[PDB]
Every structure is written in structure tokens, then in C-alpha cells.
Chains A and B, each alone.
With several copies, the nearest count.
Chain A
């Protein structure tokens, strides 16, 4: 639903962050790129926050994708 770009060269698990927009919020549905079954997402404000807390996570380079993936998969927001 109103799909946009990824976060920077998945994979490393066949898992991806796969940010895509909603009409008001933006969902960050951590998912595969094969058959399609995701793990837990998180809904929040626009891309301007998405790059902000995405850059606000530790590690360098690919570890930001991975620590972002573990950070979203233990979600609070249903």
C-alpha cells in the first residue's frame, strides 16, 4: 500500500526493513523479499523521523539495518 524505497541493501537475513508509506503515518514493516511473511512493524511519523532514529541506532553500516531490525521486531505498537 503506497510503497517506497528500502533501508540500504537488504539482506543479511533475506530480511529487510522495507519502509512504505501510509496516507498519514508511515509503516516500517520488517519483512522478507521472498514469499512475503513479515515480522512486527512499527507505525510513526514521516520519513524525516525514519532517517533520524534510523541513524540514531548504534553500529556502523549494515549493523544499523540489523539493530534496526531487532529494534522493530520487539515492537510496542500494534
Chain B
């Protein structure tokens, strides 16, 4: 009775746009309209040998010629402007409604169950602290991923617009906010009251974000790389394709979701160490770890696999409902 779905799939509510990096000077911070985009340049590198070598079967004269030579290659490193101190990241993340109304329903009884569970976990557990996870661990600008490293002051300006007009105009300073523990902020509770007005289907909400890392002049970045699968043979020159919008530098939405999908310290191992990206199987791509392994019971794919039969997770539900928000 009431088996799991044969093929379930949920829409990514709480969606995410692309970023267009563009560079600015402070006290010209407010006038970010004619701020020019940052074209992905092309450096050309000569290599070295920092990689460790094998320990099975060798000959010690190979590293004389290998460690001698230069396997040189071109790298399309996106570099700032000459006389520009600030930065830019223009992303309208719009939050869809319907936290658990599906997109595929391989059994309608399971759909009535899961709508019952959005009714419970949206009726009982208020989304105050829920969207305080999706804001207080994404206003502290994990938005800006590797370019967050040693900013002078990375200022996030989450404007919000009905229309061409914009009413919710909240400004921040994301270096005053940690990335390991969410601390009590009033305006962060306003923005989480607004994503409260988003995920629980109250209003059209698209948050036009304009993050300004005030780092320095011509320094490098952390733009999202493309790939070199069957294109390292026709060109065979580039090795790091920093992906582009029309004439600018992307941050791919794929990276941009675990800026905001980084929600839960509700994992198995850590306490205040690691706040990973709230996923099915909770796997981070960096560490090659599997937080919340199969043998543990903190899977997303054990949260309705137990909750759809026995109704007990008890506030690890949030890392089993936010696995369904995206």
C-alpha cells in the first residue's frame, strides 16, 4: 500500500539566472548602468611539472626530459579592467511557487501524499528559518564563489522589482556575515519573509541581485569554466574556456545553484565545520565525499522513502524538503 513513485521529478522552484560580470569604481558604485562587461581574454602559458608521478614501474631518466620540457598551452583567463576596483554580478533569481507540486506523477496517490507533506511542512514548520537558510547563507555572498576570496568589501545589493519599478531595495555587506553559521539579522529576516512570500505562493518575486566585490584592479577571477570534450583536438590550444554570455563572462547557473543550495549543516558528520550544498545524497563535488551516505539515513532519497510511510523525520525534514525545492 502506497508505494513510491516509479518516476518522480520536481521543478526547480527558487530558480536562478546567469551572472554578467562588469567592473566599476567605488563612489561610482550607485551608477552601475554603463558599467562595461569583462571580456574573457586569452593568456598563453608555459607549463612546469608540479604533478606527482607514478610509483608502480618507472625509469628515473624520464623526468630529466619531461621535467625539462615545456608542455605549454593557452588558457583563457578572464582578467579585470586596468583602472577598475569593483566588480559585478547581475542575477535575477526568481523563486517559483509550489514547493512540492510535482512535474511528473507516476502514481497520483503518491502525489496526494507529497502535497500532504508540503501541507504539513509548510503548515507546521513555518518557512521563516527555512528562507533564513536560503538568504543568510546566500546573502553572505556565496553567490560570488571563488572571487569571494579576500575581498576588501563584497557588497550585495538585492534589489527587488514588481515591474520596471522596484520596491524591495535591501543593501548589505557580505563580509560581515559568516559562511558557517547563520546569525540573527533583521533585514535578513525581511528577505526571508520575502522568500516566505515566494515559496508559499504569494507573489511574483524576481530578486535582481547586483553584487559588488571591491577587491582590486586587474586581478583574476573565478568565472565558470566550459569544457574540452572533443574540442581539444580541432583547436587543441585552449585548456580552460571561461564561458560567455553575449560579450561578457558567465557564471553558469549550474554553479550558481549551490551558492543558494548550500543550506544544511544537518549532515551526518560535521557540527560547525562544513555547510554543504543540500542535495540528494548530499555529495559535494570538491571533496569527493558522500556526506549522508546510503548506510546513514540522512538521504533525500530516504526522506519520502520513510516519510511517505511513517511520517517521522523531525526537523531533518528541512534537508529532505529543500532537496525538493531544487
Mark each residue of chain B from 281 to 302: 1 if its CB lies under 8 Å from any CB of chain A, else 0. 0000000000000000000000
Mark each residue of chain B from 163 to 178: 1 if its CB lies under 8 Å from any CB of chain A, else 0. 0000000000000000
Cross-chain contact of A12 among B54, B56, B229 (Cβ < 8 A): B229
Cross-chain contact of A14 among B53, B54, B62, B73 (Cβ < 8 A): B73
In the complex, B70 has a CB within 8 A of chain A = yes
For residue A35, give the distance in angstroms from its CB to the closest CB of chain B.
6
Per the 8 Å Cβ criterion, residues 50-103 of B in contact with A are 51-54, 56-57, 59, 61-62, 65-67, 69-74
Binds A, one of B34-42, B122-130, B195-203, B233-241: B233-241
Chain B residues whose CB sits within 8 angstroms of the CB of A61 once the complex forms: 228, 232
Cross-chain contact A11 with B71 (CB below 8 angstroms): yes
Contact residues of B: prevailing secondary structure: loop
In the complex, A58 has a CB within 8 A of chain B = yes
Cross-chain contact B69 with A6 (CB below 8 angstroms): yes
Contact residues of A: prevailing secondary structure: loop
Per the 8 Å Cβ criterion, residues 144-162 of B in contact with A are none
Assembly CA distance A33 to B65 (angstroms): 9
Per the 8 Å Cβ criterion, residues 11-36 of A in contact with B are 11-15, 33-36
In the complex, B227 has a CB within 8 A of chain A = yes
Instruction: Identify which of B62, B230, B233 gathers the most chain A CB atoms within 10 Å of its CB.
Output: B233
For residue A71, give the distance in angstroms from its CB to the closest CB of chain B.
11
A34-B49, A61-B228 as given contacts; A10 in contact with B69, CB under 8 Å: yes
Chain B residues whose CB sits within 8 angstroms of the CB of A34 once the complex forms: 49, 51-53
Cross-chain contact A60 with B62 (CB below 8 angstroms): no
Counting contact residues on chain A (CB < 8 A from B), the size range is 20 to 34
Cross-chain contact of A69 among B57, B66, B67, B236 (Cβ < 8 A): B236
Instruction: Identify which of B51, B52, B229, B236 gathers the most chain A CB atoms within 10 Å of its CB.
Output: B236
* Interface, chain A (partner B; CB < 8 A): 3, 5-6, 9-15, 33-36, 48, 58-63, 66, 69-70, 73
Cross-chain contact B56 with A48 (CB below 8 angstroms): yes
Cross-chain contact of B57 among A14, A15, A48 (Cβ < 8 A): A48
Assembly CA distance A22 to B49 (angstroms): 27
Chain B residues whose CB sits within 8 angstroms of the CB of A35 once the complex forms: 53-54
A12-B71, A70-B236 as given contacts; A3 in contact with B59, CB under 8 Å: yes
Cross-chain contact A3 with B72 (CB below 8 angstroms): no
Cross-chain contact A12 with B233 (CB below 8 angstroms): no
Chain A residues whose CB sits within 8 angstroms of the CB of B52 once the complex forms: 34
Chain A residues whose CB sits within 8 angstroms of the CB of B56 once the complex forms: 48
Chain A residues whose CB sits within 8 angstroms of the CB of B54 once the complex forms: 35-36
Cross-chain contact B233 with A33 (CB below 8 angstroms): no
Chain B residues whose CB sits within 8 angstroms of the CB of A36 once the complex forms: 54
Cross-chain contact A66 with B62 (CB below 8 angstroms): no
For residue B27, give the distance in angstroms from its CB to the closest CB of chain A.
44
A10-B69, A11-B69 as given contacts; A66 in contact with B230, CB under 8 Å: yes
